[PDB]
Design a protein around this nucleic acid. Structure first.
Ligand code: MG
Length: 691
RNA sequence: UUUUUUUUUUUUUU
């Protein structure tokens, strides 16, 4: 049986007296018998031995623990339940007046369900539901019971199918994808089609006549930012970042505000998008669509050709985007800088602005961005980007026809450098104005122990590396023989490995953090940062807009407690990471299906680790990690030797015929090999073998 | 309750 939880006051006293420790529970997915929490000082985490010591806690919960003598601790309370208490799993079935629900997530415990709650068709033939995904909600977990009690929510459908699995990911991670309540939709404008009131135009700087445009993916539905660039007579440039003024449409403390605060961010699945706001805002009103007057909150600079700021300006504005460019369009402009492109290979453009004018703007914005970026890395910036997958979906069926590695081009970077520049400018502005109430975004450095151990590992394999800083590492991960697919492959593998010690970036209230040296963003290597440029799809930006609004005197002094503001930040962090897991799982889902439907898929891969009966590989064409087992390979024998510091795996291939002699193949780390991905019998499961 | 330890990140647009 489990242990009885502690009292509210006993715990509150414990946390206050240091005797008890707070933290976020992490459960080992490979060995669910093991759970961990971070320690306030020591770089080594605290160990939770067994499920009993976990005390019915779940992964993600903010738990309280008491230390044990000879690290090791036991859970004694749960101050905040952060797990959704909802899971995707399968139903099956002595005291047989219950059913056994098995969550796909091994971190989640198995759940008892009352048979009376179960479908009649399941009662008759449970084996019919062997591959039927249900949603189950943990309603309780008794201290005497080994399993937890739950309520069957609904049937999603067959496992492995896209839409059922999608809803499973969304629900399991607590993403609200419901229609918006009527009390929310009444906060929206009621006079449609909505036009900007005349009195506002006077209050704002009217940029509707200026050449402003947007650059986003071809499939973009919610355009948050717009850009502009003029060359001044004195050789300098006037760049402008115009963000949709969502703050205007979302009154603080309204039903619309509360649901936005809850949803915290938009979720970008592969085939669809779970929006933060209603579509009337996300896609029509706030969205900076072309050839329509839009309310914006802008940042404008007078910039050096190198991107150095000469003077800086904030203020509410109003624009009329002359065109909606895609990154492909922008790139074509950049690659053909002195050629009038056929005006049919480009999107519709407002008649009051020529294509040549926009073309020139992109070229100039590229020129500065090119310089802004190059400078950023000289100043010790870290780009640690792994391979990302993009899919091509059959519009008839929705299934994926294929996939490709997403290419991050000059047009992509163009936008990035100015969104960066804008966000920093606002970070400095609100913090300089309201030092105790600034909604900023820091990024701590890597964990000392993990990184130090990784550097040691890299000392072997003949790969000395400097990691004294973010910048030092960045140069190391771009310091290769270059040119060839091997060094590029090794680059990607090392990019992965050095991501483990890295910590997540955090929203935070300025006044709630003492040491300002911790305000730093490790990877960007800057003293201050925040999110401001994407208020349609991110609530953190909305709060910053309200703060910036107050900094310019558009509203009263902010009367929010730093405590309250941190709560918003905490929740924003929670939904942000949760959103990332979902977006990743969505990609994983579609690739699994793609592997299943498009037969076996070939690809080159690089070895990451080597064990005595298997080895891990990074599949290059897809950026997935898979383990290859010697059992699955048609081998006649295989040997494992660890001499030479690094592990090596020697394979002997069994020929299919007596004519062919057995071929040998040594597998060591950073080895380039061919692999094929075949779908297994299980849903969304596929294996890797060495071709 | 998985064919051989938690930390897989950062940045930009969606
Ligand atoms: Mg945009």
């Amino acid at each position: 049986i489990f242990e009885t939880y502690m009292s509210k006051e006993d715990v509150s006293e414990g946390l206050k007296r240091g005797t008890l420790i707070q933290g976020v529970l992490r459960i080992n997915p490979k060995k669910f018998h093991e759970a961990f929490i971070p320690s306030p000082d020591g770089d080594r985490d605290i160990f939770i031995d067994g499920v009993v010591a976990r005390n019915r806690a779940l992964n993600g919960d903010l738990v309280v623990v008491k230390l044990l003598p000879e690290k090791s601790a036991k859970v004694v309370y749960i101050l905040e339940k952060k797990h959704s208490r909802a899971a995707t799993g399968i139903l099956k079935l002595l005291f047989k007046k219950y059913a056994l629900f098995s969550p796909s997530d091994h971190r989640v415990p198995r759940i008892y369900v009352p048979l009376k709650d179960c479908p009649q068709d399941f009662m008759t033939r449970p084996k019919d539901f062997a591959n039927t995904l249900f949603i189950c909600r943990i309603i309780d977990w008794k201290e005497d019971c080994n399993f937890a009690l739950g309520q069957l929510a609904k049937s999603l459908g067959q496992a492995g199918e896209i839409e059922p699995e999608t809803e499973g990911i969304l629900t399991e991670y607590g993403v609200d994808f419901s229609d918006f309540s009527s009390e929310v939709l009444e906060c929206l404008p009621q006079s449609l089609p909505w036009t900007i009131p005349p009195d506002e135009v006077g209050k704002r700087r009217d940029l509707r006549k200026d050449c402003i445009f947007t650059i986003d993916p071809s499939t973009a539905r919610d355009l948050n930012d717009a850009l502009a660039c003029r060359r001044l007579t004195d050789g300098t440039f006037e760049v402008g970042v115009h963000i949709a003024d969502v703050s205007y449409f979302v009154p603080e403390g309204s039903s619309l505000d509360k649901v936005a605060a809850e949803r915290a961010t938009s979720v970008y699945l592969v085939q669809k998008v779970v929006p933060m706001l209603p579509r009337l805002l996300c896609e029509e009103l706030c969205s900076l669509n072309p050839m329509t007057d839009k309310l914006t909150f802008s940042v404008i600079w007078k910039l050096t050709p190198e991107g150095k700021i000469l003077e800086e300006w904030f203020g509410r504005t109003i624009i009329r985007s002359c065109t909606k460019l895609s990154y492909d369009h922008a790139q074509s402009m950049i690659e053909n800088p002195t050629e009038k492109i056929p005006e049919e290979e480009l999107p519709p453009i407002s008649p009051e602005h020529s294509v040549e004018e926009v073309h020139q703007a992109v070229l100039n914005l590229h020129s500065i961005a090119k310089q802004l970026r190059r400078q950023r890395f000289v100043d010790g910036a870290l780009r640690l980007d792994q391979l990302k997958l993009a899919f091509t979906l059959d519009h008839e069926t929705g299934l994926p026809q294929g996939c490709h590695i997403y290419e991050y081009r000059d047009s992509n970077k163009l936008v990035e450098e100015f969104m960066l520049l804008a966000n920093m400018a606002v970070a400095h502005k609100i913090f300089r104005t309201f030092p105790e109430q600034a909604l900023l975004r820091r990024h701590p450095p890597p964990q000392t122990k993990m990184l130090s151990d990784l550097v040691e590992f890299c000392d072997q394999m003949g790969l000395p590396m400097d990691v004294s800083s973010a910048g030092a590492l960045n140069k190391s991960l771009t310091k290769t023989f270059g040119d060839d697919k091997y060094s590029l492959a090794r680059k990607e593998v090392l990019t992965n490995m050095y991501s483990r010690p890295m910590q997540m970036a955090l929203y935070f209230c300025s006044g709630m953090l003492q040491d300002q040296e911790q305000f730093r963003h490790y990877a960007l290597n800057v003293p201050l940062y925040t999110h401001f440029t994407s208020p349609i799809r991110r609530f953190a930006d909305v709060i910053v807009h309200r703060l910036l609004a107050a900094a310019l005197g558009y509203s009263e002094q902010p009367d929010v407690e730093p405590d309250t503001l941190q709560k918003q930040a905490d929740h924003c962090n929670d939904r942000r990471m949760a959103s990332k897991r979902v977006q990743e799982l969505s990609i994983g889902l579609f690739f699994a299906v793609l592997v299943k439907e498009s037969g076996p898929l070939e690809s080159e891969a690089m070895v990451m680790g080597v064990l005595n009966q298997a080895f891990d590989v990074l599949v290059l064409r897809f950026g997935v990690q898979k383990r290859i087992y010697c059992n699955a390979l048609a081998l006649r024998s295989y040997s494992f030797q660890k001499v030479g510091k690094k592990p090596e795996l020697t394979l002997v291939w069994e020929p299919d015929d007596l004519e062919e002699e057995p071929t040998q193949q040594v597998i060591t780390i950073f080895s380039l090999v061919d692999v094929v991905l075949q779908a297994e019998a299980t849903a969304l499961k596929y294996s890797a073998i060495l071709k």
